Amino acid sequence: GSMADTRRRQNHSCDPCRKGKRRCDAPENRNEANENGWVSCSNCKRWNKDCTFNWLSSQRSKNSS
Ligand SMILES: [Zn+2]
Ligand SMILES: [Zn+2]
């Protein structure tokens, strides 16, 4: 709060939106979202981008694409 503070994980928006400062429906479980019925955030579906949580992948470990 006072010492430790950063903005990265609070953003749930998928790869393309978080980059473009866009907040989407894509939760922290967009994968499970697909299972539930979701598939891609309105941004990806609107601009026909690519809904992915690569940002999430390269966090703890620099996961490649
Ligand atoms: Zn998005
Ligand atoms: Zn998306």
UniProtKB/Swiss-Prot annotation:
Q: Which signals induce this protein?
A: By ethanol, threonine and acetaldehyde. Expression is autoregulated and subject to carbon catabolite repression.
Q: Where does this protein hold Zn(2+) 1?
A: 14, 17, 24, 41
Stretches the record annotates as Disordered = 3-35
Q: Which sites bind Zn(2+) 2?
A: 14, 41, 44, 51
DNA-binding residues (ranges) = 14-51
Subcellular location per the Swiss-Prot or TrEMBL entry: Nucleus
Say which domain of life the source belongs to. Eukaryota
Q: Where is the composition biased (Basic and acidic residues)?
A: 15-33
Q: What does this protein do?
A: Positive regulatory protein for the ethanol regulon, alcA and aldA. It control positively its own expression and possibly in a negative fashion the expression of the gene coding for ADH-II.
What name does UniProt use for this protein? Answer: Regulatory protein alcR
Coding gene?
A: alcR
